[PDB]
Amino acid sequence: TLEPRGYSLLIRGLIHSDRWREALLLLEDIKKVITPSKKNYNDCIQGALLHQDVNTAWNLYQELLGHDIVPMLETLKAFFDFGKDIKDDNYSNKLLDILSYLRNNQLYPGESFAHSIKTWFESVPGKQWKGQFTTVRKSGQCSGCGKTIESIQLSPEEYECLKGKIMRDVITTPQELKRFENFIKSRPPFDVVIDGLNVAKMESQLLLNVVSQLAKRNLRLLVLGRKHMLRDEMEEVQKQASCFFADDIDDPFLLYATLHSGNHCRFITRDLMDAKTQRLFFKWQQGHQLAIVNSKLTFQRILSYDTVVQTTGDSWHIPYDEDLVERCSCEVPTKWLCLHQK
Ligand SMILES: [Zn+2]
């Protein structure tokens, strides 16, 4: 089932004119048959902002979020662009809410969006915000203002908060889950938990390469596999590491094993996926996932600080993506917008 024919382009062609309200009527027609696209919402929001109807713009944005649509970054950028000319506490709080959206969903502005945010803070009368484009030192100190970036390390309470929350949503076969439970609880904490299956994707001898090289680093390795790997050098893997072979049916064993082992334990697998718990999960993932980067194997660096939109009230630090640099799934941005009040 599709939008009425040509409606997205009709909407896009109306929003700069005095007839822009007609686009919102077309959007209503779309809603009645399908969930509108993020581009549909982008267009109607920009139409509203172009004509200073901030309530309509924000209401459309909230509707979009209600459908669990991920807004285009261009839509978020539009709110800051129009905000430089808007002097109102209520509008400001909405913008700060968009920054919380980026923080909570582990998202980053593109370069021009970062410039729009900078421009908006610097436009707020009386507040004396100054923005600078920076990097972060190895130490975790912003190269602009010298403040220490939020630690990537979860506190014990945070960790047990996350762990407890994860343990209770988990609760495939229960008979097989009990077996794995008894396996883990009768063993010491591991240092790296390896999804042998999902790393055998880039069968046997590269699993061996990951294992045999990690074992030279004096690490306690757990390898998670399925039964079908037992049907040569798998036996070479079984001897170099502790192994659990599940049924060939996706397993929740990697999360359990890693979290049970403790806050020090890291893991290897495919890239992974309330607000506070979600924040902790992103932070934990960033600091604990070991990403393989491609013939002698090397891992992606894990920093001591959390690369995420963040604030201290009197400052913001906002990682952003550069136009000239394409970033992979598992790597964090290296460039930051540093905002501080004088
Ligand atoms: Zn700074």
Numbering used by the authors: 207 to 377, 386 to 416, 422 to 450, 458 to 475, 478 to 501, 510 to 530, 535 to 582
Relevant lines from the article:
The PPR domain is connected to the metallonuclease domain through the central domain (residues 334–356 and 545–583), which comprises a four-stranded, anti-parallel β-sheet (β1 and β8–10) and harbors the conserved zinc-binding site. A long loop region between β9 and β10 (hereafter referred to as the lariat loop; residues 560–575) intercalates between the metallonuclease and PPR domains. When comparing the structure of this region in Δ206-MRPP3 and the homologous PRORP1, it becomes clear that the Δ206-MRPP3 active site is distinctly different from that of PRORP1. In human Δ206-MRPP3, however, the equivalent residue to N492P is R498, which occupies the metal-binding site, and forms a salt bridge with D478. At the same time, D499 is flipped out of the active site to hydrogen bond with the S569 of the lariat loop. Δ206-MRPP3 adopts a relaxed, twisted, L-shaped conformation with the metallonuclease domain being moved out of the plane formed by the PPR and the central domains. We propose that MRPP3 is kept in a non-productive conformation by a dual-control mechanism, namely by the presence of a non-productive active site and by the orientation of the individual domains toward each other.
Transcription in human mitochondria gives rise to two long polycistronic transcripts that are subsequently processed into mature mRNAs, tRNAs and rRNAs by the mitochondrial RNA-processing machinery. The third subunit, MRPP3 (also known as PRORP: proteinaceous RNase P), contains the sequence features of a zinc-binding domain and an N-terminal, putative RNA-binding pentatricopeptide repeat (PPR) domain, where the PPR repeats are helix-turn-helix motifs of ∼35 amino acids and are found in a large number of RNA binding eukaryotic proteins. Furthermore, the MRPP3 subunit harbors a C-terminal domain that carries the sequence features of a metallonuclease; MRPP3 has therefore been assumed to be the endonucleolytic subunit of mt-RNase P.
